[PDB]
Design a protein around this ligand. Structure first.
Ligand SMILES: NC(=O)c1ccc[n+]([C@@H]2O[C@H](COP(=O)([O-])OP(=O)(O)OC[C@H]3O[C@@H](n4cnc5c(N)ncnc54)[C@H](OP(=O)(O)O)[C@@H]3O)[C@@H](O)[C@H]2O)c1
Ligand SMILES: NC(=O)c1ccc[n+]([C@@H]2O[C@H](COP(=O)([O-])OP(=O)(O)OC[C@H]3O[C@@H](n4cnc5c(N)ncnc54)[C@H](OP(=O)(O)O)[C@@H]3O)[C@@H](O)[C@H]2O)c1
Ligand SMILES: NC(=O)c1ccc[n+]([C@@H]2O[C@H](COP(=O)([O-])OP(=O)(O)OC[C@H]3O[C@@H](n4cnc5c(N)ncnc54)[C@H](OP(=O)(O)O)[C@@H]3O)[C@@H](O)[C@H]2O)c1
Ligand SMILES: NC(=O)c1ccc[n+]([C@@H]2O[C@H](COP(=O)([O-])OP(=O)(O)OC[C@H]3O[C@@H](n4cnc5c(N)ncnc54)[C@H](OP(=O)(O)O)[C@@H]3O)[C@@H](O)[C@H]2O)c1
Ligand SMILES: CCCCCc1ccc(Oc2ccccc2)c(O)c1
Ligand SMILES: CCCCCc1ccc(Oc2ccccc2)c(O)c1
Ligand SMILES: CCCCCc1ccc(Oc2ccccc2)c(O)c1
Ligand SMILES: CCCCCc1ccc(Oc2ccccc2)c(O)c1
Ligand SMILES: N[C@@H](CCC(=O)O)C(=O)O
Ligand SMILES: N[C@@H](CCC(=O)O)C(=O)O
Lengths: 255, 254, 254, 254
């Protein structure tokens, strides 16, 4: 991997522990130009300060709430006007109400169900549709998933079903965008301490189970997701699409 | 043999609905049945189809699964009229026609969330309400399609909604397992129904199964029903979180 | 109901064999049954077990599946004595105890190939011979474990033999489908059996299912039998190449 | 960058070997390579092809993986000549021609076990011997095919051997994980190689990939090499027991 002359859009950095920030450090070290999108004001503040550890000469920052069609549309439109054509997009975005990340899955409200679907799954579809305008001769889109999309897992609840959805959204976008030379793939990350993880029931007892039971007998970090992201986002992976690569110490393969 | 059993079948529109295949089999096997519908026309078709069944009473409730109120009051009224039930057959899905053909990447937010709402979320709330009527346990089965497991031409928004449904099944199985309520899926191969008439390329697929699947023939609604009868009965007492493919073997080949 | 159906059950050792849970269930449903066993310390023993069943007469045949001759002549004799059959329950596996614990990287070539031979290949030759007695179609079922789909501690060489078995089921299903012979697997949860004693860490696993599987309990031989009856009968007519987990929901969680 | 890395590549026969795609990519990235072969002809081809490589010296070892002693001694020799290694690329399978066409249920014992021994078991014993040369960890990658996961036409005995390999991969992963050795598979799409010339319907499968696979084209050996570089380097730290489909997306559609 050498990524000079490539440009990637990274969605979903909130702070220095975001998985997406591990992705940014890996592409930035490999020479990529990076463009960042955020929702909260605070996230933009964290980004402005995090850019200082990065080799990026210019901060390219865009507020995109992927709940709004408008913002996703105008956002990628503006990126294209500012930095020209891009080579792919790292998607690191999900959301559920607290209520819905513990207790009984059977008590999920309609509203918290669809909210999780909207932000964590649907958002990839609209991003794919808008980013593709910026990839007239091909590129790579990567989303972040979790083993809870493949098995029923304690507490993950409404997000499990949103990840199952995301993982199919990836396969369907791969089939659709493939003839355009646009590849689409998931990374299934193992548990990592991030802002978002602090809201998931039983996160610590899962962290520890990995260490004890996963083939590598250790947890992964954001940089390790970064390294697999670079592979997927680069020509090193040009034969690979509709795939989900587990970066989880091997925990997916055992029972 | 399901005498003294009571099942709620959701989703008969007409004589060709998969759920009517379920109904015939369970009726033949001695079960009391209760039916739920959305459209006026479906109650009409239902009243007529009961004349072919051995149900001596018509138990028909209008439940639109987009309304919590209707699901809640629906099942509550079922509880008052027939008492405790032994399982629920979920046979409900919907997507707008334009989201069943062409390019998936062009799917609207509203299109996507409508598919999810009716074809996946509806299972969670139905399970929640139906639970109240199974103090001793019971069985819930949903209807899915292989496009939930793989990207399949045209199926589009519905394939993402089935992937959600199939997951919804695993999560409900885990949640409701301690209450002795099994939750499973049947993944039916393609069958000519009213809804099937709205999916691009249905006919192509139907004939490819016939040519390519291990059994070299398509399945029908009665074969779905017979697998439902297994899953809804004590025959399948140790099975939950499972997706049985009733699809002539198509799922095992490539 | 299975009156006027005939099944070959392969792999009874003692009162605890999964195969015998299958037999009680098929016998209770009125099938005629034929039994195969490996050596004599099942023969005197099998004759005592059958007193429990309602088989009016014992049809018992020595087949060690390591020998083609015994598989071929065994099935030939069956056809001469009992006529055409409706299906086979395959309940047979073997590995050396030393390969069922410790480090999988340390498995011998001989131990690896023995587990393959007896645990997987045998289904292929049994299916070839059985087909001869199923001119109008039929049903073949093998017994597998979740350790064919995931790396699981200790199971080691048998895990790779089951992955092999589970593919064997898919390939047999495609091959024999046009002859209307369905081939499936049941993935049984842990059950206390003669063979289970030689598997490292078995009790640890059994206790864990009870703590963690959706149903919070273990399954038994009879629950395997009930799903076997489904798979062996016309109730499953549209299902082939399938692997049903009878395991309290354990496969669906992580 | 792979300077200061050494990888053993097993199974180049000629310029079209998948393993030679791997070697052109590793050699390009700075690695030192050691090659293993069976036939004298493969050695001849290896000496010819090394003129296209940056490798300053040839490191060729004859290892027929049917022999324990050749594997044990070959790797032992490799350690003595190059010292500790960073990884192995495994690109070895074999079945008799008669088992790559026609009816799977007609496979002989000897042909089934031959394919197992060469195509699956060999990875186990190669892992055990190579582990002696990886005290600080490393990476082992085997080459599989979609046919290990689904019943595919003609592939027959080798599909069951691939199921076996893919499980062999998971079990090696769990086993060698604590030693910091990662074990993974690449599922390559179909590519014109010497051994592909012996597989039934190989041409029609190639063309179907172009017509149906998401990228509407076939892959080549170098694309496998690229993914191999990733699996073999620190880029994939974290990844083990994984199967990456380098196949234009074909695994994910139906
Ligand atoms: N950490 C883990 O254990 C784990 C494991 C597997 C997969 N994942 C996945 O990894 C991804 C990244 O999450 P993380 O763990 O890195 O946590 P995180 O740092 O909290 O990142 C979550 C990001 O989602 C963004 N987001 C949520 N709603 C949004 C919206 N409506 N519009 C735009 N952005 C929105 C947030 O931005 P704002 O702060 O601006 O709202 C935030 O940047 C998620 O998909 C997650 O599900 C996490
Ligand atoms: N045919 C196939 O090839 C196939 C294959 C695999 C799985 N399936 C699945 O099998 C199930 C049954 O469909 P089908 O093919 O039998 O077609 P169908 O006869 O058209 O039945 C579909 C049913 O869905 C109901 N429905 C849709 N929206 C609803 C709502 N908001 N509230 C309550 N009911 C609603 C319809 O009721 P109303 O008419 O009253 O609106 C109708 O009874 C679906 O889940 C479908 O996805 C079908
Ligand atoms: N017990 C469990 O928790 C569990 C779970 C899932 C799957 N399974 C599977 O269930 C099946 C039945 O095993 P089980 O647990 O019921 O134990 P079992 O009672 O000991 O049955 C295994 C049977 O295989 C027979 N067998 C071994 N090698 C043979 C050969 N070369 N030729 C003919 N027969 C041979 C044994 O016969 P002999 O008495 O003559 O040696 C015995 O009858 C096996 O496939 C096993 O892998 C078991
Ligand atoms: N080509 C494809 O479409 C495709 C697709 C998916 C996976 N694969 C897999 O890729 C791998 C490489 O195959 P290929 O297509 O590149 O064909 P290939 O060039 O013909 O290579 C096959 C290799 O296997 C070696 N081999 C067979 N038996 C052996 C033994 N007993 N000991 C040592 N080596 C032995 C051969 O060595 P000798 O010539 O010296 O005997 C040869 O180098 C295989 O695992 C194959 O199953 C291929
Ligand atoms: C169930 C315990 C492990 C969960 C791992 C994990 C942690 C953070 C995750 O990110 C989330 C973002 C929004 C809502 C919920 C989660 C995640 O997806 C997955
Ligand atoms: C992709 C072609 C095969 C489609 C098979 C099939 C047919 C009908 C189906 O039922 C519905 C489809 C769309 C909306 C509502 C219900 C189905 O789920 C699956
Ligand atoms: C891994 C611990 C759970 C074992 C469950 C289990 C028990 C018995 C089993 O049957 C065997 C038959 C012969 C040799 C070895 C095993 C099995 O397959 C699976
Ligand atoms: C089924 C048609 C596609 C075959 C793809 C393919 C081609 C070559 C392959 O390599 C083989 C090596 C030895 C025996 C058999 C095959 C392969 O595994 C897979
Ligand atoms: N399960 C606790 C969290 C405790 C933990 O992290 O282990 C909760 O409901 O948040
Ligand atoms: N099916 C032929 C190969 C010719 C083709 O694929 O057209 C065979 O027996 O090898």
């Amino acid at each position: 991997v050498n990524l000079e002359n490539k440009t990637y859009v990274i969605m979903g950095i909130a702070n220095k522990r975001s998985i997406a920030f591990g992705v940014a450090k890996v592409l930035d070290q490999l020479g990529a130009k990076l463009v960042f999108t955020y929702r909260k004001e605070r996230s933009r503040k964290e980004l402005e300060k995090l850019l200082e550890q990065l080799n990026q000469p210019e901060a390219h920052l865009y507020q995109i709430d992927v709940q709004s069609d408008e913002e996703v549309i105008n956002g990628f439109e503006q990126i294209g006007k500012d930095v020209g054509n891009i080579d792919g997009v790292y998607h690191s975005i999900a959301f559920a109400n607290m209520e819905d990340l513990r207790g009984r899955f059977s008590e999920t409200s309609r509203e918290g169900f669809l909210l999780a679907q909207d932000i964590s799954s649907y958002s990839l579809t609209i991003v794919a549709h808008e980013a593709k305008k910026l990839m007239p001769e091909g590129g790579s889109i990567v989303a972040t998933t979790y083993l809870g999309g493949e098995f029923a897992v304690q507490n993950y609840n409404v997000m499990g079903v949103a990840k199952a959805s995301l993982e199919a959204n990836v396969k369907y976008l791969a089939l659709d965008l493939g003839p355009d030379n646009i590849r689409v793939n998931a990374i299934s990350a193992g548990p990592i301490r991030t802002l978002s993880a602090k809201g998931v029931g039983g996160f610590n007892t899962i962290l520890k189970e990995i260490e004890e039971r996963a083939p590598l007998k250790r947890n992964v970090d954001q940089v390790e997701v970064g390294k697999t992201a670079a592979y997927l986002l680069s020509d090193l992976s040009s034969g690979v699409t509709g795939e989900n690569i587990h970066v989880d110490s091997g925990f997916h393969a055992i029972k």
